[PDB]
Every structure is written in structure tokens, then in C-alpha cells.
Design brief:
The structure is a homodimer.
Chain A (H helix, E strand, L loop, with lengths): L2 H9 L4 H6 L4 H9 L6 H10 L4 H6 L11 H6 L2
PDB class: dna binding protein
Keywords: DNA binding protein
Assembly: dimeric
């Protein structure tokens, strides 16, 4: 996967409330969600405020549980 | 700092050779370098291929040497 696919996977699961509380535009956010527009550093910034544990996975697709860097599938599998 | 500032710090230090060998457009790369255009996931993808140890720092501004995630200033200070 690309960083954009991993970012969009998280973007598709966040609505106006969490986007607004972490300081993003929702209108842009929805256009990124749909694929209409490229994921920028702006979206990465909001996601890493929302999901600080996913910052490594977003950028690289890898995880490091040793330093509290996980992924959505990892957290789901770890419940 | 933002992810865009940290990305541009690395983008400003990479020329056509390393950009091309990791599969990016240089013309876009230079427009991102100058600030003319937003840093996208495309630039993050090339940077994390070039600098896999900086993927966490690019996304979050933090480091984790425990898992080989560093920064430019950290590596320079560690010589």
C-alpha cells in the first residue's frame, strides 16, 4: 500500500467532530476521503493528532509496538 | 513544526538522482521544495524510501531510536 491508501483508510473512519476538534477542514477532508483530491501533509497532521500511535504506519506501512506505534489491524487483533 | 516543514527539510537536501532512483518526479519535487505546492503522500512515499529511518519523524516530529527511527539532527549529533 501507499501512504495515501493508509491515510484514506483512517480518513474514511473519522467524521466532522474529530476532524474539527483537531483543527482540520471537513470539506477538504471529505474530498480527500473520496479520492477526488491528493492526501497532503495537512491530513497527515490531523491524523497523527487523532492517531498518534499510527504515525509510523501511516508514513511507512510498518509498525513498532516496542515504542507504541501500531496499526488499525494490529490494535483490532490485540483486543 | 508541521509534517510539511520536516518533509521540506529533507526534500531541500535531495537532488534529481535519488528522487529518480526512488521513483518520483523531480519537477514536482522542486515545486514542493520551493513552497509553491503542498507536500503530498507522493513526496512522503519517496522520502520514506530514501530515509526509512525518518518515517516517524516526518509524520510526527518525534523519534524512537529503540526501533531505528531517528532524525537528521539526531543522526548528526550521534556521529
Amino acid at each position: 500500500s501507499t501512504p495515501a491508501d493508509r491515510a484514506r483508510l483512517l480518513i474514511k473512519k473519522i467524521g466532522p467532530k474529530k476532524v474539527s476538534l483537531h483543527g482540520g477542514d471537513y470539506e477538504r477532508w471529505k474530498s480527500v476521503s473520496k479520492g477526488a483530491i491528493r492526501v497532503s501533509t495537512e491530513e497527515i497532521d490531523v491524523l497523527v493528532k487523532i492517531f498518534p500511535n499510527y504515525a509510523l504506519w501511516i508514513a511507512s506501512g510498518s509498525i513498532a509496538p516496542e515504542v507504541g506505534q501500531t496499526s488499525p489491524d494490529y490494535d483490532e487483533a490485540n483486543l
